[PDB]
């Protein structure tokens, strides 16, 4: 047992014809406070993987260490470490999951919701959830905690099913996923404006598109609202 102290909000993601995407604002909250305006929630592993973490930063920072520390560990006595024999996304996650479980099974978890994304050497898309409880699942769309309730909806309008991935253009993926990111900021107290998106395409590769703003918002209409029922003037 324990309690979460600093908190990362959501992490949204989806697959497309070539590869996958995964975004997550850069805010680490201290309850109702925002003691940290610019914090990294996307650890790319190798160059075919990235990990969007959502929950406790103290815990998240630990994992990072386990990754870099596992990564440096693959090298060790193995020449093909940059080509044939090298970390696939499916691996890391498998190891990650393994861990999260032992933990809940030891009554002391890591307060985190995690997404593993990337592409398999043989070209396949990978996207899978894994939280403090050691639970997991694949899906064309995936969002952590706050996401899934609000993001997933729109992301499912692009891909209602597995039979749409083939026809999901890298650009249509992006803009939509960002419209989602605008919405997460429209109705969620835990969210930030700055963020970090990343793409892993089997053709182009990894494209860490760090630090951006959420633009284009209809606020003007605000001026028209007055009172709550009677208050006219």
């Amino acid at each position: 047992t324990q309690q979460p102290i600093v908190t990362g909000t959501s992490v949204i993601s989806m697959k497309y014809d070539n590869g996958v995407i995964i975004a997550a604002d850069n805010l680490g909250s201290y309850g109702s406070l925002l003691r940290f305006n610019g914090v990294e929630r996307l650890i790319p592993v190798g160059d075919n993987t990235v990990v969007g973490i959502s929950g406790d930063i103290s815990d998240m920072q630990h994992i990072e260490r386990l990754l870099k520390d596992l990564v440096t560990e693959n090298a060790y006595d193995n020449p093909l470490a940059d080509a044939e024999e090298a970390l696939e996304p499916s691996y890391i996650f498998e190891y990650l999951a393994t861990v999260m479980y032992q933990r809940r099974s030891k009554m002391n978890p890591l307060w985190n919701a995690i997404i593993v994304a990337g592409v398999q050497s043989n070209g396949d898309q990978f996207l899978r959830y894994v939280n403090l409880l050691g639970v997991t699942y694949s899906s064309p769309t995936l969002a952590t905690g706050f996401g899934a309730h609000m993001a997933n909806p729109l992301l499912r309008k692009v891909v209602d099913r597995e039979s749409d991935i083939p026809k999901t253009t890298v650009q249509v993926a992006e803009e939509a996923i960002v419209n989602a990111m605008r919405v997460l900021y429209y109705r969620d107290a835990r969210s930030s404006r700055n963020f970090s998106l990343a793409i892993i395409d089997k053709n182009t590769g990894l494209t860490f598109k760090k630090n951006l703003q959420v633009e284009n918002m209809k606020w003007d209409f605000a001026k028209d609202i007055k009172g709550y029922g009677t208050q006219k003037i």
């Binding site: 047992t1 324990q2 479980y101 809940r104 099974s105 009554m107 978890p109 959830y129 409880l133 050691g134 639970v135 997991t136 699942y137 694949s138 899906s139 064309p140 899934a148 309730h149 997933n152 099913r161 597995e162």
Partner: protein
């Protein structure tokens, strides 16, 4: 405080056909009032012509299966790839399951296959270990909506021979696999209509004396 458990809905089903066996169970996955994945398999082949599935709490579930699929593998290593008679597998599972008696696996698990005579065989499990040779069992959320039905349809419970007054119960007869799968799909649709935690799709593993077959049929995304 920390709550180490959770429910991901799901409903599975096992019928012991005369000389076959089915293990069906939908593909939905849930949390509170949300969705996780439209498609997520809970039924698996573990080799040796044996199917399994554990519904309740995913993590405890898939761990058990994993923990089992490995215990099968190791059985071959020590006994020269001898086949695991289904009955055996179950006595084995009992233990695995009972291993975590005072911190159980929060799940209702079921297996199905064939005995050392060719007869279909199903096995229902307690979340800690009690196993029974069932010839038909539904486990999961919808459980109470399908079990009453199979009661009736599969065993003709409360059905008598007309004109006999109510002195002659209608005799059981064994239905072909086709016949069974028709029942099964109907069961699930009815269940999806009246149960929120159930819908989306249905994946069926059919066991027979030459392998495992898989057939899928889509349900409503209610």
């Amino acid at each position: 405080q920390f709550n180490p458990y959770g429910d991901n809905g799901g409903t599975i089903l096992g019928i012991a056909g005369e000389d076959f066996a089915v293990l069906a169970g939908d593909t939905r996955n849930i949390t509170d009032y949300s969705i996780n994945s439209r498609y997520e398999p809970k039924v698996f082949d573990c080799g040796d012509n044996i199917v399994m599935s554990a519904n309740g709490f995913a993590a405890d579930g898939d761990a058990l299966v994993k923990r089992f699929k490995n215990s099968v593998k190791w059985y071959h290593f020590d006994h020269n790839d001898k086949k695991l008679s289904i009955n055996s597998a179950a006595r084995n599972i009992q233990h695995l399951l009972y291993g975590k008696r005072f911190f159980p696996y929060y799940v209702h698990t079921i297996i199905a296959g064939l005995d050392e005579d060719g007869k279909g065989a199903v096995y229902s499990f307690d979340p800690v270990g009690s196993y029974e040779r069932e010839q038909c069992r539904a486990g999961g959320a919808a459980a109470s909506l399908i079990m009453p039905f199979l009661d009736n349809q599969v065993n003709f419970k409360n059905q008598y021979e007309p004109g006999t007054n109510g002195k002659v119960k209608k005799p059981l007869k064994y239905l072909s696999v086709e016949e069974v799968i028709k029942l099964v799909r109907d069961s699930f649709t009815s269940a999806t209509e009246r149960h929120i935690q159930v819908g989306d799709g249905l994946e069926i593993l059919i066991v027979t004396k030459d392998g495992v077959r898989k057939e899928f049929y889509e349900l409503k995304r209610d």
